[PDB]
Amino acid sequence: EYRTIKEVVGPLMAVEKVSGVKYEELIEVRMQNGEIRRGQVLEVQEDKAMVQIFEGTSGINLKNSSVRFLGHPLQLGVSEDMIGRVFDGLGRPKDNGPEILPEKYLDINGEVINPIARDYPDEFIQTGISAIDHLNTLVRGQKLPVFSGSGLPHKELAAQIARQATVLDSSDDFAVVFAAIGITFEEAEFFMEDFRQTGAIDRSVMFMNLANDPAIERIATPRMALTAAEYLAYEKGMHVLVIMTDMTNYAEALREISAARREVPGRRGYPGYLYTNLATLFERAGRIRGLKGSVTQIPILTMPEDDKTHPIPDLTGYITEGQIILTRELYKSGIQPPIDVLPSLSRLKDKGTGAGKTREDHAATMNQLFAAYAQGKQAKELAVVLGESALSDIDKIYAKFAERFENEYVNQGFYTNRTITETLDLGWELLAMLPRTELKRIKDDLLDKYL
């Protein structure tokens, strides 16, 4: 209870004659009316600490207020009782259910995994979305992000993935850890109602951070959620899928704190250390040798002005193992989910596909559909530039193929869960439009088996 508040500058506060204070250590303000507000140390010096109050600073009288240094940072009280429960980004409950009986409290930064300790992703994950499952396969322990944009339905996509995510022929079930970072009430309620509506909550733990919640809480959210996931995965042995939206909102908060400390931005207005910060988060995923469970991450981010050159998607792309890209071009023609296969990529698909995991024909068809769609789009262009007549009959087919591929294969709807077998079968059905002579990237062995 130091009664030594020297300055208030906006939500920033200067506290004097304090000792033993650490960076990022939590604080309490006891105001003159008795009101309590919480804060965190943003800077600490020999004689003073800079703190940020979460509720802001209005109405505080400096000389009549007191500050208490709690002696610790933000910590998460882990328990196996958090499954099927909703929290805010600080881990307090938002569902009005019973209080959490914590096994222990953990720091939320986590640790770097010794590389020789990591296990290669082995298992296929059935998202139920053909565009992902077939052409951009997600594998247990991968980091596969979704790159979206403002006004694009990553909300729906995220909810779908969270309903449909499953491993095959395992009776073992996915714990889904869901983090919302600085999202609107309307978006957060949609996610909460969806999880409740479909019973998806019974497997899930939700950390729900809102846009009008403090920036500091917003930076805390992903770390709270990943600590919980690592607990469930590497302590409880569960297989965990972590879904985080919107990552651009997290970078936004990082800027806010960065300026508070008067740090000059690196590239495009963001902290120099953004890469370390994002890397640190995303690398908390995978399999570890000699440990039953795994963490799989799907971070969702919006690319400002649809710019893949933007530091957020660009730096994220280096860290994560591929990316799924939604485009408004597709969205505006009613393609749901509007996933563009051409610029999307999974870097570990091969490890999750073929005989024994999906079906033997997986890879070959993916390669073929990918090419035929590329060829189809080219054929479409040709149609415009040179006219109906210059088109080969083989060319007209590719045109029709690309049209059906967007309209029937990629456009499955936000509530349609396709098994890998249906997806594979539909691909074949679509490939069947072409002559055998054209399916050059499939062994005749497979052509004769599947048509």
């Binding site: 000792s19 033993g20 204070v21 650490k22 960076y23 990022e24 250590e25 943003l42 800077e43 600490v44 010096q45 020999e46 940072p73 930064n109 640790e111 770097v112 995994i113 010794n114 590389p115 020789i116 300790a117 960065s258 400390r261 740090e263 250390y273 640190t280 570890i288 040798r289 440990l291």
Partner: protein, 194 residues
């Protein structure tokens, strides 16, 4: 050698320590009680500006800064081959064994090479031979393929007074040389800044 200072400011990746006059620019240092890695970018009187490359969360003023005495270096000797390291030469295999943990725990300090291991050092040079940097005084068959030649390290000019074959660790004296600064002892390893 090791130099201890005191942290006067913590601000994100930036730490400032005073009483660092024995430290130099570009020196590596261990920051805070915990001991996460940092580098001295700046020096004002006795105040060093330090970039910290691990999470500074939970570090505060009053805590030490331990200076390594040197800039980023590698240990070079028998035990290097076949090992897997990180960028600052942290031995990944040893991390697993000593640590009994799956993590590169922060603040954990481990020498790049095994300093406890026995090596047969075959002396091939003779006493009374004049030597300078680069001359091979002996070798060790380090692996099934490669022969590790033990070279007179840079900065040493002299005559070999005593040398014997036998089993030594990379920390044992294996040769004596008559320099201009009297007698000097050589071991099987040398340090070089990266």
């Amino acid at each position: 050698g090791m130099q201890i200072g005191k942290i006067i400011k913590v601000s994100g990746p930036l730490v400032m320590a005073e009483n660092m006059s024995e430290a130099s620019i570009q020196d590596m240092c261990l920051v805070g009680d915990l001991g996460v890695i940092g580098e001295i970018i700046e020096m004002r009187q006795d105040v060093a500006s330090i970039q910290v490359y691990e999470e500074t969360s939970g570090i505060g003023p009053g805590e030490p800064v331990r200076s390594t005495g040197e800039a980023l270096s590698v240990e070079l000797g028998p035990g290097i081959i076949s090992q897997m390291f990180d960028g600052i030469q942290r031995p990944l295999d040893t991390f697993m064994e000593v640590t009994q943990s799956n993590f590169l725990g922060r603040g954990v300090q481990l020498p790049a090479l095994d300093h406890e291991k026995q090596w047969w050092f075959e002396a091939t040079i003779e006493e009374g031979t004049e030597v300078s940097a680069g001359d091979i005084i002996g070798y060790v068959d380090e692996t099934k393929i490669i022969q590790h030649k033990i070279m007179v390290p840079n900065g040493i000019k002299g005559t070999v007074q005593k040398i014997e074959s036998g089993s030594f660790t990379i920390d044992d004296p294996i040769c004596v040389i008559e320099t201009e600064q009297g007698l000097k002892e050589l071991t099987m390893m040398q340090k070089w800044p990266v």
